[PDB]
Scaffold this active site. Structure first.
Site, PDB file in Angstrom:
ATOM      1  N   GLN A 215      -6.814  -5.166  21.319  1.00  0.00           N
ATOM      2  CA  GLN A 215      -7.795  -6.241  21.411  1.00  0.00           C
ATOM      3  C   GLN A 215      -7.876  -6.886  22.789  1.00  0.00           C
ATOM      4  O   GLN A 215      -8.981  -7.151  23.273  1.00  0.00           O
ATOM      5  CB  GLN A 215      -7.488  -7.322  20.368  1.00  0.00           C
ATOM      6  CG  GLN A 215      -7.981  -6.996  18.970  1.00  0.00           C
ATOM      7  CD  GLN A 215      -9.480  -7.165  18.826  1.00  0.00           C
ATOM      8  OE1 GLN A 215     -10.048  -8.163  19.267  1.00  0.00           O
ATOM      9  NE2 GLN A 215     -10.130  -6.185  18.207  1.00  0.00           N
TER      10      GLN A 215
ATOM     11  N   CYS B 164      -0.988  -5.738  10.369  1.00  0.00           N
ATOM     12  CA  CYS B 164      -0.690  -7.085  10.835  1.00  0.00           C
ATOM     13  C   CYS B 164      -1.535  -8.087  10.057  1.00  0.00           C
ATOM     14  O   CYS B 164      -1.316  -8.284   8.858  1.00  0.00           O
ATOM     15  CB  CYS B 164      -0.932  -7.209  12.342  1.00  0.00           C
ATOM     16  SG  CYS B 164      -2.536  -6.603  12.906  1.00  0.00           S
TER      17      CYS B 164
ATOM     18  N   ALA C 295      -5.567  -8.691  10.703  1.00  0.00           N
ATOM     19  CA  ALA C 295      -6.773  -7.892  10.534  1.00  0.00           C
ATOM     20  C   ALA C 295      -6.521  -6.402  10.708  1.00  0.00           C
ATOM     21  O   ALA C 295      -7.347  -5.591  10.273  1.00  0.00           O
ATOM     22  CB  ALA C 295      -7.854  -8.345  11.520  1.00  0.00           C
ATOM     23  N   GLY C 296      -5.411  -6.026  11.337  1.00  0.00           N
ATOM     24  CA  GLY C 296      -5.029  -4.632  11.431  1.00  0.00           C
ATOM     25  C   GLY C 296      -5.648  -3.855  12.568  1.00  0.00           C
ATOM     26  O   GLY C 296      -5.836  -2.640  12.440  1.00  0.00           O
ATOM     27  N   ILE C 297      -5.969  -4.509  13.684  1.00  0.00           N
ATOM     28  CA  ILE C 297      -6.598  -3.818  14.806  1.00  0.00           C
ATOM     29  C   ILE C 297      -5.950  -4.240  16.118  1.00  0.00           C
ATOM     30  O   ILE C 297      -5.816  -3.430  17.043  1.00  0.00           O
ATOM     31  CB  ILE C 297      -8.119  -4.067  14.835  1.00  0.00           C
ATOM     32  CG1 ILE C 297      -8.427  -5.565  14.902  1.00  0.00           C
ATOM     33  CG2 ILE C 297      -8.787  -3.446  13.619  1.00  0.00           C
ATOM     34  CD1 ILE C 297      -9.907  -5.887  14.869  1.00  0.00           C
ATOM     35  N   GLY C 298      -5.539  -5.502  16.209  1.00  0.00           N
ATOM     36  CA  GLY C 298      -4.958  -6.020  17.434  1.00  0.00           C
ATOM     37  C   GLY C 298      -3.527  -5.583  17.663  1.00  0.00           C
ATOM     38  O   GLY C 298      -3.270  -4.655  18.435  1.00  0.00           O
TER      39      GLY C 298
ATOM     40  N   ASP D 218       3.138 -16.001  18.856  1.00  0.00           N
ATOM     41  CA  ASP D 218       1.820 -16.385  18.365  1.00  0.00           C
ATOM     42  C   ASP D 218       0.779 -16.373  19.477  1.00  0.00           C
ATOM     43  O   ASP D 218      -0.408 -16.151  19.210  1.00  0.00           O
ATOM     44  CB  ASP D 218       1.881 -17.766  17.712  1.00  0.00           C
ATOM     45  CG  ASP D 218       2.776 -17.797  16.491  1.00  0.00           C
ATOM     46  OD1 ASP D 218       3.441 -16.777  16.215  1.00  0.00           O
ATOM     47  OD2 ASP D 218       2.817 -18.841  15.809  1.00  0.00           O
TER      48      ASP D 218
END
Ligand SMILES: Cn1c(N2CCC(C)(CN)CC2)nn2ccc(-c3cccc(Cl)c3Cl)c2c1=O
EC number: 3.1.3.48
Length: 477
Positions: free
Chosen positions: A458, A411, A413-416, A377
């Site tokens: 990110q 994941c 938001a789908g970017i990190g 996390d």
């Protein structure tokens, strides 16, 4: 917004002083604060307000505001939506920076670079280094072809020039002026085409580059972060009223020119990632977008899904359950899905799903869901072995399926975390096919993917983790 408002190495004390002496009300700037957090310093009524922005790996969380994909998209959103940054904080004037440490062409202390421009240069390749003769001055070295020309940059009273003409306040202003108005020699045109590429290395010397970057990564990352301003493409479809409730985060939207279009409304927060393998980077399903998610999987002929998050993490929801329980059978609109079997390893769990449209029988196909569960996390994994073994299995499952569509990766938001897995998968595909004799360019590959979805990769912890994963894959070969 050309990212000039971001100061890479300024303190909070210096940030206030710059706004009080060289800025007026409405002037703002951004700086890195806690490793991983950022600060938005804004001037108002002669006072400076410091807004906190946290990014643990998923998104940029501005304290008291919405969540964004990049700092450029954050500044752009508030410089056009007055009254939403709260008493109201108006973003009017970017206080620009002069530190060239984040520019691609600035190499700082470098010996009189002739070798670098020869072994790894082309026509127009250039760099700016510190002068070894007169301290304080700089040198601009350009390859032209055949020859490497040097041009002195004298520093006089906090200003820069090439011996005549206009005196500039920043080396960047000097470079940007001569990139469009090149210097013509008295016999040759010193064109500043592209900066010298000192990040493209051979797969054999990757361990030596990590050793040099480990004593480094932070400087190269913010050099890539400065170029994010060239990626402010339009995201209009996600801003439409009918599609507002279809995004998990209202301001993290897919690019219009790479979004996935459905033909069965046509919107889903997803983008095609093209580097033979292609990817689909999307967000975690919402309760009211599960039916659209399976429309995309059926349409694109995808047979593998890569899930890199739990349904709930830190008590917050990251993705709703869009797959049936083991042996169950569910209908999600016109799509029928059955959970055939579940195989559980340590780091992940494989779920063999069978997707088909209702009414048509011969449309069935197996969709292999890979749910990575051991992701921390806070931060990134310590050892890349588990992720590398996870991606190696996903690759061979994909290569065994003929005419299989793109790989769906998601994941929260789908970017990190999504961008980290996809980039690592791309770099390894080069090594697995072209052996160790190939060249890899980590920041160029990330910029190539960031142009197809907003904010891929990110944090710097993910950036360094990508290098560690590549180095680990080499040593175990
Ligand atoms: C030369 N160079 C450098 N260094 C010059 C600046 C540094 C900080 C030394 N002071 C490191 C080496 N860092 N770097 C980071 C990302 C990219 C990059 C590569 C391809 C495409 C795009 Cl868009 C970008 Cl941003 C580069 C780069 O090309």
């Amino acid at each position: 917004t050309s990212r000039r408002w971001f100061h890479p190495n300024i303190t909070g004390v210096e940030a206030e002083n710059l706004l009080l002496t060289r800025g007026v009300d409405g002037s703002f700037l951004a700086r890195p604060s806690n490793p991983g957090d950022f600060t938005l310093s804004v001037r108002r009524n002669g006072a400076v307000t410091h807004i906190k922005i946290q990014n643990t790996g998923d998104y940029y969380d501005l304290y008291g505001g919405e969540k964004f994909a990049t700092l450029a998209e954050l500044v752009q959103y508030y410089m056009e939506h007055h009254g939403q940054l709260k008493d109201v904080i108006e973003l009017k004037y970017p206080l620009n920076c002069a530190d060239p440490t984040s520019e691609r062409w600035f190499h700082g202390h470098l010996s009189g670079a002739e070798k670098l421009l020869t072994e790894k240069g082309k026509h127009g390749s250039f760099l700016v280094r510190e002068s070894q003769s007169h301290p304080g001055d700089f040198v601009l070295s350009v390859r032209t072809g055949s020859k490497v020309t040097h041009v002195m940059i004298r520093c006089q009273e906090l200003k820069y020039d090439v011996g005549g003409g206009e005196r500039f306040d920043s080396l960047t202003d000097l470079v940007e002026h001569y990139k469009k108005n090149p210097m013509v020699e008295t016999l040759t045109v010193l064109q500043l085409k592209q900066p010298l590429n000192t990040t493209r290395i051979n797969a054999a010397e990757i361990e030596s580059r990590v050793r040099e970057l480990s004593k480094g990564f932070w400087e190269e990352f913010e050099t890539l972060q400065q170029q994010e301003c060239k990626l402010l493409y339009s995201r209009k479809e996600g801003q439409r009223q009918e599609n507002k409730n279809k995004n998990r985060y209202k301001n993290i939207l897919p690019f219009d020119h790479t979004r996935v279009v459905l033909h069965d409304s046509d919107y889903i927060n997803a983008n095609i990632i093209m580097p033979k393998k292609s990817y689909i980077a999307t967000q975690g399903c919402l309760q009211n977008t599960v039916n659209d998610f399976w429309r995309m999987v059926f349409q694109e002929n995808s047979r593998v899904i890569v899930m890199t998050t739990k349904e709930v993490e830190r008590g917050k929801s990251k993705c709703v359950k869009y797959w049936p329980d083991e042996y169950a059978l569910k209908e999600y609109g016109v799509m029928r899905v059955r959970n055939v079997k579940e195989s559980a390893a340590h780091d992940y769990t494989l779920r063999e799903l069978k997707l088909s449209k209702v009414g048509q029988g011969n449309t069935e196909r197996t969709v292999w869901q890979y749910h990575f569960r051991t992701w921390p996390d806070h931060g990134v994994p310590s050892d890349p072995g588990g992720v590398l073994d996870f991606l190696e299995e996903v690759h061979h499952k994909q290569e065994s399926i003929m005419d299989a569509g793109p790989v769906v990766v998601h994941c929260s938001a789908g970017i990190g975390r999504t961008g980290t897995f996809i980039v690592i998968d791309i770099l390894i595909d080069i090594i697995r096919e072209k052996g160790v004799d190939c060249d890899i360019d980590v920041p160029k590959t990330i910029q190539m993917v960031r142009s197809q979805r907003s904010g891929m990769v990110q944090t710097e912890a993910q950036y360094r983790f990508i290098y560690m994963a590549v180095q680990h894959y080499i040593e175990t070969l």
